[PDB]
Every structure is written in C-alpha cells, then in structure tokens.
C-alpha cells in the first residue's frame, strides 16, 4: 500500500526580556537650553553651543 | 488682615555701593576662575631702573 504524507506541529513560547540604559543632565547646564529668557546674545553664544 | 509692604533694593540707598548686573549663565561658567587683575600706578623715579 501507499504511504500518506505526514506533517508535524509545534508550539513555541515567547521568552521575554528587556534591556535599559540611562544618562543624566546637570542642573547648571539645564536653564541654558530650554529657557526663552536669553534675549539677544545668549541664544547664539559659545556656552549654549 | 495685614499687607506685605514690599521693598525694592534699587530704590534703597545702599545701591550706591555696588554695581548690580545680571549674569544669566554664571552658574554654568562658574566652574572655572575668572581672574582679572586691575592696575597699579608707579612714579617715575630718577636713576635708571
């Protein structure tokens, strides 16, 4: 007699992980970037760059 | 109730002693020294120095 074409089956599980990193900003160099108080010459200065 | 009579510094008298000027980025640039000398006068004494 002939043979029937078998086929398989499997169930795989997702194994979960996570990686994380971080940095930090100084309080001194904080107000130099965001704050819109710097009017005329402190927007294009060397310290802000 | 009672109010809080505010007082301005520039409208005081002591303001004559000091020149006040706002320096926004100082706390950042305060990491190093500023270090400016001033002067010293000198008489022209006779005889070769």
């Amino acid at each position: 007699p002939a043979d029937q074409p078998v086929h398989n089956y499997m169930i795989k599980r997702l194994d979960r992980r996570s990686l994380n990193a971080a940095f930090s900003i100084a309080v001194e160099a904080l107000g130099l970037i965001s704050g819109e108080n710097l009017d005329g010459t402190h927007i294009s200065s060397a310290m802000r760059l | 109730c009672s109010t809080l009579s505010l007082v301005r510094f520039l409208e005081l008298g002591l303001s004559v002693a000091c020149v006040c000027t706002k320096f926004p980025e100082l706390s950042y640039v305060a990491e190093g020294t500023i270090q400016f000398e001033v002067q010293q006068p000198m008489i022209a004494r006779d005889g070769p120095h």
Side-chain angles (χ1 to χ4, degrees):
Chain A
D3 51 354
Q4 276 76 16
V6 298
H7 52 88
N8 306 343
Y9 284 106
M10 288 173 314
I11 303 190
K12 304 309 200 59
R13 178 182 298 275
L14 276 77
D15 191 358
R16 202 170 157 212
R17 301 155 156 276
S18 70
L19 57 85
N20 43 2
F23 69 103
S24 315
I25 321 183
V27 61
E28 303 152 83
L30 189 55
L32 292 188
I33 321 183
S34 46
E36 323 272 0
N37 295 315
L38 309 184
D39 45 353
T41 76
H42 323 269
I43 47 154
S44 160
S45 313
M47 292 72 64
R48 198 174 184 191
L49 289 193
Chain B
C1 170
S2 159
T3 52
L4 310 94
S5 291
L6 61 95
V7 54
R8 312 291 300 172
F9 180 74
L10 312 192
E11 303 174 3
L12 261 190
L14 179 54
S15 81
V16 290
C18 83
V19 62
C20 203
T21 177
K22 176 154 154 159
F23 194 26
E25 80 265 37
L26 188 148
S27 162
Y28 185 81
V29 79
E31 67 91 13
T33 182
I34 293 311
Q35 195 189 23
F36 51 97
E37 69 93 8
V38 290
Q39 191 48 254
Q40 171 169 305
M42 36 186 288
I43 200 84
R45 185 64 266 160
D46 73 303
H49 169 256

